[PDB]
Amino acid sequence: SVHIGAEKGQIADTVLLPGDPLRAKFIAETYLENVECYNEVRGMYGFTGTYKGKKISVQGTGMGVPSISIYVNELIQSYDVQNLIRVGSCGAIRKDVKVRDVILAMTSSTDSQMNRVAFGSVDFAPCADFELLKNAYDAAKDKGVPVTVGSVFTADQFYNDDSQIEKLAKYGVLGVEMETTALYTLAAKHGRKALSILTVSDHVLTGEETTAEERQTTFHDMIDVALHSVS
Amino acid sequence: SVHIGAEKGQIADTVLLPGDPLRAKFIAETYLENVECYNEVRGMYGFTGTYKGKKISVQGTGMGVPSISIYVNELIQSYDVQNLIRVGSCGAIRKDVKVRDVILAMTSSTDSQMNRVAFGSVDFAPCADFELLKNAYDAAKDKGVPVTVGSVFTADQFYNDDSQIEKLAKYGVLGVEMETTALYTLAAKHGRKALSILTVSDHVLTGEETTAEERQTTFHDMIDVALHSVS
Amino acid sequence: SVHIGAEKGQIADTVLLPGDPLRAKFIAETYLENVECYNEVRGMYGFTGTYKGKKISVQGTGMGVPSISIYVNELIQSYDVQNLIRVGSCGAIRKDVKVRDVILAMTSSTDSQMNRVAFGSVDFAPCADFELLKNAYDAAKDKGVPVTVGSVFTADQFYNDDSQIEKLAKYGVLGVEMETTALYTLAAKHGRKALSILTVSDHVLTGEETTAEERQTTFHDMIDVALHSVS
Amino acid sequence: SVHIGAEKGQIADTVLLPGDPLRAKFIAETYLENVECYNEVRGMYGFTGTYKGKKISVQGTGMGVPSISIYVNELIQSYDVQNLIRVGSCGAIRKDVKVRDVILAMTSSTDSQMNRVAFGSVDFAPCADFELLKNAYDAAKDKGVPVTVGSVFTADQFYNDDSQIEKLAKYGVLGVEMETTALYTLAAKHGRKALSILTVSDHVLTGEETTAEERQTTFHDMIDVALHSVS
Amino acid sequence: SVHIGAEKGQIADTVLLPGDPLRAKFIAETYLENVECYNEVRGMYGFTGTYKGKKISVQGTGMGVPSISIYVNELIQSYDVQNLIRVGSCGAIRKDVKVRDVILAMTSSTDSQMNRVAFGSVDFAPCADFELLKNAYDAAKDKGVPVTVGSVFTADQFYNDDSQIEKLAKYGVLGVEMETTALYTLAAKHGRKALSILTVSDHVLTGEETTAEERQTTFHDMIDVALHSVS
Amino acid sequence: SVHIGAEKGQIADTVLLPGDPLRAKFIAETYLENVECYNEVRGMYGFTGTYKGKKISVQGTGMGVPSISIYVNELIQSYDVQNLIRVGSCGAIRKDVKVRDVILAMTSSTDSQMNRVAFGSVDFAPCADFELLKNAYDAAKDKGVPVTVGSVFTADQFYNDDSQIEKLAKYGVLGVEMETTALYTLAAKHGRKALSILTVSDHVLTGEETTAEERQTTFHDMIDVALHSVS
């Protein structure tokens, strides 16, 4: 595989997908037993290890549809990965999305052309794998972790003169990130399972920041939910 | 309201949405107590009645994004309707979608331009209200009704020289109907709740028909699921 | 035929196409001899009968490109229908379109994606069959019925936050309805003949309503023109 | 006016619009009394003269939407031109369009982006002014000149690897030229009157050429029809 | 060749491409030895002659993507033309583009659909042939003629209610003309060499005109640069 | 600045832009004096150091329009960067592009929607800053490094079922990468200077790989050209 320097078997059925390869390192080393690094290519670290005696891998994706598509493609095609879970965050675009909320994306809107390229006059709506979604949801409820289930917006431009998120907020969209559409689309295409779990980095519309302590907590809940949504 | 001849209060918080106004009549009269017809405009019958002592209405929608949008718009704007549930069927486009399956749409793809008109370079992904979805799902599981959760395709043309459903099947899309995108989009826009529950009228790709008896059963399960997903 | 429960021969060469299936019933029973109903499917009534000893049928279409396309498709493919005439109304978008005017559409603009789906980078301009147009025009002139000949706009959304009709008015477009583009496109594709004849339900831009009496008259003139444009 | 070197009044209410400025010269000098040339700018000759004691002008347009738009724009804006009549030819794309036929375009399809630029998600259908159309039609019938009334295709590329005219033929489109959409669109926008009258230069699909003698005749009929459609 | 009445060999490897066929005549007769006119078709004059003992031709193109595409297509396909150089002018859309500047276009933006037709979801960026570009640049520098190298905008509409040139100026685009995209695209497609050299007819945004004397000079420099960029 | 943890002044006027943050480290440490790392955020290392007594920085960009846009945006907005030079490689899509060639992109095509989002019906052609281009070209020629000047294709999908590069090759496009369009577009928008210099990682169409030794050499020439194109 071109972008991942690993061997047959070095990668688990379940990969967790942060955007930052340093959060990849942090996650593995903080949460997992007998950790191994399998990829050092391009600094986009991946790691396999164990959680409750079950194998789990953690691969960085980079930022943007185009970067994540690369990793998801190779993970699926070259390493027969079965379940794929994005664990990152997003800018919240609604007031009712609270900074302690954990978002489970049923679907994703986008200004990426990726789907228009393949489909033309169809708006393809990507779709989370429901069984993973239900699991993650259950895992949250049973521990009373605050959870919201709805849609997000996979953007191409972080800095965006022509942002239409105001209109997206008005249609119930929860927050904007930059990966989900690609994950959900590529996974479904290959008959695989995928889900994005997200925390709120800030409220983008009402301006305000969230604190370091608030981020640590919700981060930690995201990884918890992800892990138990699986074991 | 232009298309519905009813009075303030004559319509419930929860409306069920068949496409056929004669299935609207059938549903109400078969399932509901002390039934009343409130709309005779254009033959697109609507009915309010009672189920387990709780008010429920049933309004026909017509076929197509443009027709349902009319009814959904008026129901929401003129009659402050809170929950909206499409109960119809669809052509299945995958082999693994069985003729006894009951489909709960998390989202919908489309070749309707309705969203491109409002959004331009965004693929808007419509999103089912999750709380209704979960309810309907639970209601099925607890009675052991076979249920599938995924996406569908809201088409504009029934007869379609340029059908791309083959490609849609390959991405996990379950079946094609002609209403969901509109329901989900208009509902979310108005901060309301919506869901499409669907049965399989036929397999469109593998050609074969389903029998009258198979349709009666699954139909009956759809209305059951809808009702209990609410009470 | 899937949507029409009729037998070979039960449907005439010339079908008149109201949107409302109750105007279908009204028209037939008010204007035609030895009337027969051939379709009760979905409440979308169709009727064959006689006018001046010549067979004429009247089929409801529903509202929207997607609904009418269904009926037009089946009428053409399953019942070898030769001439198709939409008789409905429209919202007028110009001041010079008077509430007593009868509109004959030479062509139609649209925000439906139906043609973009089939054609891509082509703006397909649908085209009325001229021989029917000329007839209808003659039939009006010879009785001195006020008649206007120009274009309309086939819309997808009745209620439309992103309405561009102001700009359409400025280019001479007369009024907005929701069926013509589909009729004209499907008819021409099958080497058949089609025409939309329309009355003014209201002025949409200058706001004002038209009265019940004004509508009865112009309605009656529309059906007159349609019938004589044929006999 | 930038592209036309003429003075207030030097140009008539009725301008005839060939594409070739040498057919402009030919037309005027062959058909008109006391001829005057008013424009020599860019070689795109225009001429005013008299026909049956009534003033008529004849201005070359060039080939393509972009060129004709220039001349039509200036003629309308700078010289208050009221009626505009394209007299050129086209490649026929249907077998039933005979080489002696004279085409009156009710409307025009296009791959020009001109309308998509102004309108976005609307397919704008340009529309001939009916009163001119009727006149031209009458003028043909009364002299028994063979005449067809339908649509054409305004193309951007003469030589076209991606030609979709095969599909356009199947929808009843008669022939392809390169000016009409622009004429009809700009004229209607300015509350003016326009019409394209066309002869068949060749059959494009069935390959075959038409002879010099056949072209002279039909040409001559086109100019005849145009003139009498006015006097 | 359909649009050019010339014989095998009558046209040089290097053709200069003004838009005006009268500037074509002027150029040849002012700059070239033993001049011959080979095309009189449609008034779009072409001329072959000699400059410093080397053959050079000069063909008018008309205005617009669609017109120039015709001439470029035939010149390339029918007369095996190798180098093609547009010598015209443009409206400047930036303050820093001075009225004495000579523009060499590396590339061109457009609202023509020509490339979208062939490519769909790709923005094709046309590309000047660099060897010609470098030559022309050198030829300017060595004589100290003021020269700017950047991009332009090939527009379809001269008069443009929906002009986006303000936004184009902000991205460094230098000026607007109506031919370059077509030249560069068709030339590259046929493995040929092309370049647009342009003078400033006016500043379009800041309104002001340039004088007749300023135009004569820069014109003369354009033709100079073109010729020496070749000998 | 959100994505780069550096202080005012820590970053030079001239930044070199590899995609791989490990090639960023390699480049700096191999080519530059008194090297300093200023960014460790996300593993996307940036470094400032000295070359021939002049300050030069080297920042990784990630893969894809969306990732590079982030870094370019911050570098320009937060650190007033003046010149930006992408030094990476690309898949060659033409036979005449030799594995030892060094590509200087005058412009870039794309299937990214980034520009369509901002521009709509315009194909925006991004444009390299010519002064940097000329420098880099000169620097190559004077040392006799093999250099090609033309266009490339900025793709969104590395793995691409719907690849149109075959058609792009036919129009002279040299190779496909994933960053240039974004660089050139964002740089020009902010009145800055940018250039992509590229080596050939493989021939994508004719299949064959290039060797490790061939890559080391051309890589080394790319960095050489970049540096001297500046000093």
Ligand SMILES: Nc1nc2c(nc(Br)n2[C@@H]2O[C@H](CO)[C@@H](O)[C@H]2O)c(=O)[nH]1
């Ligand atoms: N567009 C956008 N992306 C965001 C935002 N906050 C975050 Br964390 N992201 C994510 O973080 C990366 C860029 O910061 C991308 O992967 C996004 O998924 C935001 O406020 N806006």
Ligand SMILES: Nc1nc2c(nc(Br)n2[C@@H]2O[C@H](CO)[C@@H](O)[C@H]2O)c(=O)[nH]1
């Ligand atoms: N496009 C499409 N629509 C279908 C199909 N089967 C059914 Br029931 N429908 C639904 O039935 C109506 C038309 O028959 C529309 O509302 C659709 O929701 C099908 O096989 N294809």
Ligand SMILES: Nc1nc2c(nc(Br)n2[C@@H]2O[C@H](CO)[C@@H](O)[C@H]2O)c(=O)[nH]1
């Ligand atoms: N969009 C639109 N459609 C209209 C209007 N008035 C009428 Br009657 N219609 C027609 O009536 C149906 C919806 O009311 C559609 O079939 C349209 O053809 C109007 O003011 N606007």
Ligand SMILES: Nc1nc2c(nc(Br)n2[C@@H]2O[C@H](CO)[C@@H](O)[C@H]2O)c(=O)[nH]1
């Ligand atoms: N695209 C196209 N245009 C044609 C054709 N025949 C003729 Br005459 N034209 C017209 O002639 C000019 C180019 O030859 C354009 O103005 C068109 O209006 C044809 O076969 N194809």
Ligand SMILES: Nc1nc2c(nc(Br)n2[C@@H]2O[C@H](CO)[C@@H](O)[C@H]2O)c(=O)[nH]1
């Ligand atoms: N759109 C546009 N085209 C221009 C302008 N100035 C000139 Br000279 N042109 C060129 O001149 C012709 C129309 O006047 C076209 O070929 C353009 O190349 C201008 O200010 N705007």
Ligand SMILES: Nc1nc2c(nc(Br)n2[C@@H]2O[C@H](CO)[C@@H](O)[C@H]2O)c(=O)[nH]1
């Ligand atoms: N699409 C594409 N990108 C390529 C290729 N070879 C290379 Br190195 N790249 C570049 O390398 C990264 C992905 O491998 C992207 O940044 C591209 O710029 C190729 O053959 N195809």
